[PDB]
Structures are given as C-alpha cells and as structure tokens.
Subunit: 241 residues, 3 copies
Amino acid sequence: SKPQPIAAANWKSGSPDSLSELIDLFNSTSINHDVQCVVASTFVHLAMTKERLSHPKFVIAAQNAGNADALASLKDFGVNWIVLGHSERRWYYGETNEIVADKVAAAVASGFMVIACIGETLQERESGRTAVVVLTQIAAIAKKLKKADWAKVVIAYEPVWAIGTGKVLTPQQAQEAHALIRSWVSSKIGADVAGELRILYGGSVNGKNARTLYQQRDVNGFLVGGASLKPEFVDIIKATQ
Amino acid sequence: SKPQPIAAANWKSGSPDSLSELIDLFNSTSINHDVQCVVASTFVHLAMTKERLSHPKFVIAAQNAGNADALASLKDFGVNWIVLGHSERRWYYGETNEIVADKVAAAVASGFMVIACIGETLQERESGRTAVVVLTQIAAIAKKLKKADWAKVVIAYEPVWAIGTGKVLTPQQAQEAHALIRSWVSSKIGADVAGELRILYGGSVNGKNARTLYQQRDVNGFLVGGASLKPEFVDIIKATQ
Amino acid sequence: SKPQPIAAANWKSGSPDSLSELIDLFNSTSINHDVQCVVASTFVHLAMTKERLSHPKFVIAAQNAGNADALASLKDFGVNWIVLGHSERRWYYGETNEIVADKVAAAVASGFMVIACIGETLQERESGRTAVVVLTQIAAIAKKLKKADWAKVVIAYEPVWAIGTGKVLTPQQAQEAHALIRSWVSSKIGADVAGELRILYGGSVNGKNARTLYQQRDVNGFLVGGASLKPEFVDIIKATQ
C-alpha cells in the first residue's frame, strides 16, 4: 500500500547524558517492519550519534547547510540526510519559499535525502488560505526540481498555526492537509511520484495519538520535535506499522 | 510615580524539561501589581513557551533578528518583543553601536517592543570613561529614532565591567548609572519621554538584592540572565512593587 | 624535555548547573606541574566561567570569531585564547584550509593564543592519504604566518576518521600522526619552533588512556570534547606530567 514510512526525530538541545541514554534505548530497540528512522541534529550531537548510535534502521541528518562547502563537507563527514524548511528556518531565520526551494535542490544535487517542510500560519488558516499557501510552498519547491529528484525528497507538513492554541490536530484535520498535498503532486509531478512520496505529519504527536494519526490514508510517518527527545519516540516509531 | 516596571528573563540554554517546570511555575504565579514580564529566547524555547506558557503578564521575546525577513517572519509567528544590543551581541559577535542602533530602529519600524542594552567595560570604568561611553551608546541609538519611537523602547544597563571581579554592584552604583542615562534622555529627547522610560538593571541580581535595587529612583526592573532560569526569578518579579 | 603541556576542554552544550559544579571542581583542584589549562566555549558559558572560575592555571577560550569586530570585542572582553579549525568548523560549517589559515593569522595579529586543528577523514586514511592531507592543512596555515607567529600557535590533531568505527587510537597511531606533524614544522619553519610547539591529541581520550598517550614523544596534551564536560577532565590534566 503506502511507501516506506519514516520516523524522524528533530533533536532541537538536550544534554549529552540524556542523548547518550536515548542512543542505548534506540540501539536496543527491535523494530519489526520496514521504516526509515532519522535523527536530525546540529553538529555536537551528530558526532555523538555517529559515534555510538548503531541500528540498521537509523540514519543521522543535518538541520542546515550554510553554503556549498557546508553540503560537501557534511557528505564528506558521512551525513546523507538533511531536514530543510522546518519552522525555525521559516519563522526565526526568515527563510522564504524560494530560499528553501534552492536549498532543497542544491542538497538533492549533492546526494542528500531531503525532508522538506511546509505548513501555514494561524492568520492563513483562519482566513481560509491553507490550500493556496501550502501549495504555493510546495510549488516553489517543485519549480527547482526535476521529476527524478523526487526520489530523494520527503515532505513534512507542520501545522504551525496550532502553537499556543491549546489544541492538537484531529486525524481528520491532518488527513485533509496531507490529502491536499498528495492531490497536488499527483497532478503536477506524476501519479507515480505521488504514490512513492512520503508525507510526514509534523505537528504535536505522542505515543497514543500517533497510531490513530498513522491509520489515515495519506500519512507516511512523523517529524517529531519534542517526544523525539524522550523514550516515547520508540512508541511513535512503532505506530508506523 | 515610576512607569510600568519590567521583569525580563533572558533565557540563554537550559533543558526543555526544566524550562517546562519553570513555565508551570510562572503559570501558577499570582502577581498583584502592574508589571510586564518577558521571557526572551532562541527559537526552540520560544515555540515551547508559546505552546504552554499562559499568564496575562508574560510575553515572549526574541534575542536576535538576522535580517528584514527574520523581523517580519518573527512578527508573523506571534513574537512582539526583542532584546537587542545585549552583551553576547556586543562582545562575542562584535556588534557596534551603529549596528545595534540600526537593529533597534528597524525592529521599532516592524511593530516590536525593544529592550535595548548599553553598558561599559572594565577598562572604560577604571579609566573614568563610564559617562562618555554609555551616553555615546544611547546617543547612537537615539540618532536612528524619532521621538515617537521611544514609546516602544526600553533601555537595559549591563555593567559588564563587573564580570570576574568577584563583585556585585551596590544600589548606589546602579542608581548612578541609571540616573546618568535618565538625565541624558530628559535633556536630549524630552522630560516626558524620560519619565515614561523604563531603565532596567542588567547586572547580577538575586531575590534578596532585587528589592533593595528596585527601591532606587531610576530603576524600573531587571534584565536577568542567570536566575531567570531558576525559581527565584519569581522573587525578582515580586521585587518590582 | 617537552614544552609546557596544554589541557584543553572544548565545551560543546551542558547545563549551567553542571558547568557550575565543574567550575568549583576545577577551582578546588591542586595541580602540581606546569600545564596550561583551557576551557573553550560559546559566549553564555564564557561569561559564566569568567564570572566564577578562578585558578592560576586556567584560561578561557573562544571557539569562533565571525569577523574583525568579533576578534577585537572578544579581546576587549578578556578572552585571549581561541580554538580554530576544529571539526565542527571544517565538517558542519565547511571551512576550507584557506578560511582556517586566514582565521589563525588574523587571531594571531589580534593578540590571541591560537589552538589550530588539523586531521584527516576516513576516505583519506583508508586510501593512504593521511600525510599529504594533514601536511597540506598545516601548510596552508604556515603560508599565512611569519616565523614569530608560531610563538602564539598550538596545533591539535583530530583523527576524525575514527568516529563511528567503534575504535579508539593506539598510542602508536597517535604518535605517528604527531611525529609526522613535528617533522614538517622542523624542516619548514625551524628546528627551534618545532621544539617549542605543542601538538595536542584531539581524539577520544579518557583518564586511563591519557597517561599512556602522553608518554609518547610528540604528544604535548589534549583537546578534549566529551570528558571535558565531566569530572574525569581532572584525570586528563594530571596525565600531562
């Protein structure tokens, strides 16, 4: 049915001591389905996870490449995955649709697997602009890519609009956003490409709600940015079967 | 008498776990006077504090905007406050009086409330240059501002010269530096503007000494960069009545 | 025999609470030989270590200067040491041999003591390129320096190739790399300069293996980037006699 799911930890911080125990936890975890696990981090943790993390299903990922040199030196270091367009990048650093599209394409061209993030704000959601905004984000991405490039691309949907609401997304809300993205890729890139595409849910997820979220037709995993620093990231991985 | 005081936490680091307990502590704190509390941080903690921090007296603040896009995207994210010219920026990053003045003005123009930092080094203090140095710093700030702009400006005095001395400032030393800044604004900008201006003490403060520091005529609060990561930041807030 | 050894902690992260206890540990440590201890960090920890760290043998060091202003403002803050070319800089940020050479020289010119890092990757080691690669790195450094400048220069060898191998270097492997660097400096710069030069081992080190590593002829200490956040950094210091 679905393509290979992805469980991604976006390690954002955390002590070296707790990361270390997390690495042992992951190393000692038996995972019984096909799923690509990812641990994304800044350099200090990356060399740590590279040092002691050893599980056939885990890979490490960068969170940013500053320039051409930073893409190449990262490949030279053993890092083959990179998370791009995530919210810190769009909202604290102010990266535009075009800046993230250009990063996606340049990383693709360097041999990376790319998790590319999209998602609308609260003003946009409330004013009825979700579809235009989100599809404009992925449209800017697609403009800089060839059909082939999509083999190395993963989309993550981040409902940024929900931060500070007190609210978590329903499976219904998540499926709607994912279905919307899936429709666009099918028509514009290809039915084939759309079918192989992993669209990960990037909002607030826990062990409980991940299983119900993953039951939805267009969800192919999670980009997790809180519980990924906790033992329950194991529970999220196991939701992907 | 005084304008509305400000209690500012400049979160510099800290675990997500201890920040989380701090957020509960702040949420459950009853504060019985008019005071604007601020939690300044980098993005990872900001989305956290935005997620779970909910107190009528707290607001969140950024610590830096890299460019025009980073000002705008931050406003779009819900952040209306920014701390600028703080010591990391002047001393590790080497931002000049002019670079911080231009940041202050550009943030003002984007709808931010701005805590702008000034303060002299040890060579400067010891050689008798405090007044010239500090007033030159705020002079560079004022040059890029219109009279109106001051409604969105807060000054924090950071006695950087005291780091490694073993010494903490007396209320007298703090009042002298604050009075000096207040005299300059009154004459150069306006008696009115000077009277509404919040000048925060940004040196080493604890629960004990904050109350005595706040008794001084020209102190309108604190920018705290150590105890703000601890429960006793509550004690500092409560010193502002 | 050997020049003054150096024990360098490259604090990469860590809580303010554990750093604080580490500072007390260092302050209460009696060290009975001539050795220069260094604690390198980003600004938040630097002001902390400057605040409370007081030991006749410790100095603080920066990990990066962004520009001319950032060199000068750092000197103005009291920081006289800087670690450059370390792996995060070459591998996450993509700094070239030339970019690090230019940083070394500019820091030298500003009055800094410089720990300059070199070291080969796994592809390079395995394909028999260690000598050419490592000597090309230090050659690029030397090109931007005058003979005199070397009085302010320290070399650290980082065997980056060993991360993820599961393997730690033998004293033999470390001595070979250090001897290789020592031969180059002697011939190209001077027998004298080579003899005063501190070459630090920058791979994975603990209390046990540091003493045996230090017994080697061309090892003048350690750049430590894991145990430097732990009590056993004391043990590493004490290995340098």
